[PDB]
Amino acid sequence: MKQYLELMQKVLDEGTQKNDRTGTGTLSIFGHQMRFNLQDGFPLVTTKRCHLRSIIHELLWFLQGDTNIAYLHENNVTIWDEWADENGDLGPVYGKQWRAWPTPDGRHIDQITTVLNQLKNDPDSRRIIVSAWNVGELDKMALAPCHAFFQFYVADGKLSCQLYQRSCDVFLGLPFNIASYALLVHMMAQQCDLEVGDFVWTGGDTHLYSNHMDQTHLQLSREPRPLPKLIIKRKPESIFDYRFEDFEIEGYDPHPGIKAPVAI
Amino acid sequence: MKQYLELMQKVLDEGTQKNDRTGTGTLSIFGHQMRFNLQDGFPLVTTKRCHLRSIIHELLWFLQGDTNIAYLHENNVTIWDEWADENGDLGPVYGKQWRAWPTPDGRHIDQITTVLNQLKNDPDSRRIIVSAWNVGELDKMALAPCHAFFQFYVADGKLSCQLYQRSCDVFLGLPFNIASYALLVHMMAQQCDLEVGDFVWTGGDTHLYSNHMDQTHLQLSREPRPLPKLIIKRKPESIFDYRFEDFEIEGYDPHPGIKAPVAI
Ligand SMILES: Cc1nc2ccc3ccc(CNc4ccc5c(c4)CN([C@@H](CCC(=O)O)C(=O)O)C5=O)cc3c2c(=O)[nH]1
Ligand SMILES: Cc1nc2ccc3ccc(CNc4ccc5c(c4)CN([C@@H](CCC(=O)O)C(=O)O)C5=O)cc3c2c(=O)[nH]1
Numbered sequence: 001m002k003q004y005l006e007l008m009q010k011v012l013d014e015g016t017q018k019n020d021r022t023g024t025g026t027l028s029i030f031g032h033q034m035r036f037n038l039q040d041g042f043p044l045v046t047t048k049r050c051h052l053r054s055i056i057h058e059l060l061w062f063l064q065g066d067t068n069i070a071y072l073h074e075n076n077v078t079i080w081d082e083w084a085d086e087n088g089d090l091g092p093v094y095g096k097q098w099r100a101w102p103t104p105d106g107r108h109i110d111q112i113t114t115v116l117n118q119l120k121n122d123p124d125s126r127r128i129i130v131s132a133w134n135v136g137e138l139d140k141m142a143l144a145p146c147h148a149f150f151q152f153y154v155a156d157g158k159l160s161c162q163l164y165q166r167s168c169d170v171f172l173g174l175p176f177n178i179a180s181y182a183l184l185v186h187m188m189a190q191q192c193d194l195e196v197g198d199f200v201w202t203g204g205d206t207h208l209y210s211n212h213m214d215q216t217h218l219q220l221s222r223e224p225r226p227l228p229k230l231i232i233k234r235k236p237e238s239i240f241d242y243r244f245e246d247f248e249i250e251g252y253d254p255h256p257g258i259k260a261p262v263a264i
Numbered sequence: 265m266k267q268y269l270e271l272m273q274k275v276l277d278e279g280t281q282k283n284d285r286t287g288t289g290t291l292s293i294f295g296h297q298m299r300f301n302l303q304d305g306f307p308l309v310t311t312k313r314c315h316l317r318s319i320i321h322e323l324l325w326f327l328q329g330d331t332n333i334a335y336l337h338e339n340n341v342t343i344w345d346e347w348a349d350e351n352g353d354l355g356p357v358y359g360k361q362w363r364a365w366p367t368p369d370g371r372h373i374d375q376i377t378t379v380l381n382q383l384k385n386d387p388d389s390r391r392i393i394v395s396a397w398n399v400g401e402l403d404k405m406a407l408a409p410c411h412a413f414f415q416f417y418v419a420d421g422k423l424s425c426q427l428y429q430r431s432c433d434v435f436l437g438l439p440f441n442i443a444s445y446a447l448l449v450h451m452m453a454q455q456c457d458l459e460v461g462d463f464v465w466t467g468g469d470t471h472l473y474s475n476h477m478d479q480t481h482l483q484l485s486r487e488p489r490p491l492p493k494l495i496i497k498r499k500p501e502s503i504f505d506y507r508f509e510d511f512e513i514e515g516y517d518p519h520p521g522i523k524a525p526v527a528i
C-alpha cells in the first residue's frame with residue numbers, strides 16, 4: 001500500500017544502522033505516523049499475498065483474554081510458539097492486560113468492556129484507551145508488548161483508532177499489526193452502531209532487519225493494487241462472540257507472497 | 265513556533281465540533297505528529313509570552329514523585345489547585361506513576377531510574393518507556409494523565425524522545441507540555457553524556473476550546489521569533505538533583521502574552 005511502501009523507502013534512505021538484541025542489526029528510524037481511511041477499504045497489503053486467517057485468530061485470541069498459544073496452535077498460527085514456556089504459556093501478555101488488568105489491590109479491570117460502555121454512553125470521551133503496557137508485570141511477559149497502547153475516538157458517527165507501536169519490524173510484523181487493528185475498529189464499529197473512520201498508526205523504533213533487504217527491494221518494485229473490502233456476515237450478540245467464519249474479503253488480488261526469516 | 269502555528273491552523277481547517285466533559289465545546293482533530301530538533305533551539309513559544317519558571321517547577325515536582333500541591337504553592341504554581349482535595353492531594357498522578365508504579369505483588373517500580381539505567385547500559389533497547397497510564401489507579405487520580413506515555417531512543421550519540429498525549433488543549437496546555445518534555449530530554453542527555461536529538465510530539469484528541477477562537481486567531485497573526493537557547497550551569501550528581509537555578513534561558517523575546525480561560 002502506498003503509505004506502507006513509502007515508510008519502507010524512508011527506512012532505507014534515512015534509517016540508522018543499530019545493533020539489536022538479536023545481534024542481527026537493523027536500519028532504524030524513530031517516530032512515524034500513517035493514516036488509513038477505512039472508508040477506502042481494508043488496509044491489507046497487496047504487494048505481498050497476506051493471509052487474513054492468521055490475523056483473525058490472533059485478534060480473537062486476544063479478545064478472549066488468552067495467553068496460551070494452544071488456541072493458536074489448533075489454527076496453525078505458530079509465530080508465538082518460540083516464546084511460550086513448556087506449558088504453552090506466554091505470561092500476562094496482550095489478552096490478559098486487555099480483559100483483566102489486575103489492580104494492585106486484588107481486582108481485575110476489563111478494558112474492552114469499559115471501552116464498549118464508553119463508546120455506547122460517552123462517545124465524546126477523550127479517555128477511551130486500552131493499554132497493554134502494565135509496568136508491574138512486564139517482567140512476567142515472554143516479550144514486552146510491541147503494539148502497546150491504543151485510543152478510540154468518535155466524531156460524526158465515525159469510529160477512529162490510534163495505536164502507539166513502540167517497536168516495529170517493517171517487513172514482517174507491520175502488515176499483520178495494521179490489519180489486526182483495522183479489523184478491531186470494524187468489530188467495535190458494528191457493536192456500537194458507528195461507521196468506520198481512520199486507523200492512525202504511530203511507531204517508536206521502526207526498523208527493517210538487515211536480512212530483509214533483498215525482500216524489501218523486490219516488494220518496493222510491485223504496484224500497489226486497490227484495497228479489498230471487508231464483510232462481516234453476521235452481527236454477533238457481543239464483541240466476544242465473533243468467529244472466524246464471520247469475516248470475508250473481497251477484491252483481494254495481491255502479488256504473490258514473499259518469504260523472509262524472523263529475527264529471534 | 266512554526267510547528268505549533270501549523271497545528272493550530274490545522275485544527276481550524278480540519279477540526280470537527282465536539283462536545284466535551286467540561287461542557288465548553290471544542291474543535292477537534294484526531295492523530296497528529298510533530299518533531300522539534302532540540303539542536304535548533306529550545307521550543308518555548310515566542311508568539312505569546314511564556315514563563316519558564318512554572319514549567320521548571322512542575323517538572324521538578326514530577327521528578328520528586330510528589331502529588332501534593334504544597335510545593336507548587338510555595339512557588340506560585342496554581343494550575344493544579346482546582347483539582348486538589350482539601351489536603352492538597354491529587355491522587356497518584358504523574359509523579360507517583362513515574363517514581364513508584366505499584367505492582368500487584370507489592371513492588372514499586374521507579375521508571376525514571378530504570379530509564380536512566382537503560383540509557384547507560386542498553387541504549388539500543390526498543391523498550392525505554394515511561395508510562396503514567398496506570399489502569400488500576402485511574403479512579404484515584406484527580407485527572408487522568410494527558411501526557412501519558414513517552415519513549416526514548418539513542419542514535420548517533422543523540423537522545424530523542426516521543427511523547428503520546430491522549431488529550432491536548434492546544435491553546436493553553438501544549439506550550440507547557442512541549443517545553444516540559446524538551447527540558448526532560450536536556451536533563452537526561454546531560455546525565456547520560458549524550459547530545460540532544462529530536463522531541464517528537466504525538467496527539468490523540470487535539471483540540472481548541474470554543475472560547476479560545478479569538479485568542480487563537482490573534483496569535484496566528486504573529487510572526488514567530490527565533491528560538492531561545494537553554495543553558496545548564498551545573499551537572500548535578502543525579503537527575504533528581506537539579507535546582508530551578510541551574511537553568512538559564514537566553515535570547516527569549518516573545519510577543520506579548522494572551523490570556524484565555526481554562527475549561528474546568
Ligand atoms: C523479529 C520479530 N519478532 C516477532 C515476535 C513475535 C511476533 C508475534 C506476532 C507478530 C505479528 N502478528 C502475526 C500473526 C500471525 C503470524 C505472524 C505474525 C507471522 N506468521 C506466519 C508463521 C510465523 C512464522 O513465520 O514462523 C503465518 O503462519 O502466516 C503468522 O501466522 C509478529 C511477531 C514478531 C515480528 O514481526 N518480528
Ligand atoms: C482544560 C485544561 N485543563 C487543565 C488541567 C490541568 C492542567 C495542568 C497542567 C497543565 C500544563 N502545564 C502547566 C505548568 C504550569 C502552569 C500551567 C500549566 C498554566 N499556568 C499558568 C498559571 C495558571 C494558574 O497557575 O492558575 C502560567 O502560564 O503560569 C501555570 O503555572 C495544563 C492543564 C490543563 C489545560 O491545559 N487545559
Ligand SMILES: O=c1ccn([C@H]2C[C@H](O)[C@@H](COP(=O)(O)O)O2)c(=O)[nH]1
Nearest residue numbers: 021144146167168169173174177390
Ligand atoms: O506484534 C509485533 C511483535 C513484534 N514486532 C517486532 C518489533 C521488533 O522487531 C521485535 C521485538 O523486539 P524488541 O523490540 O522487544 O527488542 O518484534 C512487531 O513488529 N510486531
Ligand SMILES: O=c1ccn([C@H]2C[C@H](O)[C@@H](COP(=O)(O)O)O2)c(=O)[nH]1
Nearest residue numbers: 126285408410431432433437438441
Ligand atoms: O498537561 C496537560 C493537562 C491537560 N490538558 C488538557 C487536555 C484536555 O483539554 C484536558 C483534560 O481533559 P480530559 O481529556 O481528561 O477530559 O486538559 C493538556 O493539554 N495538558
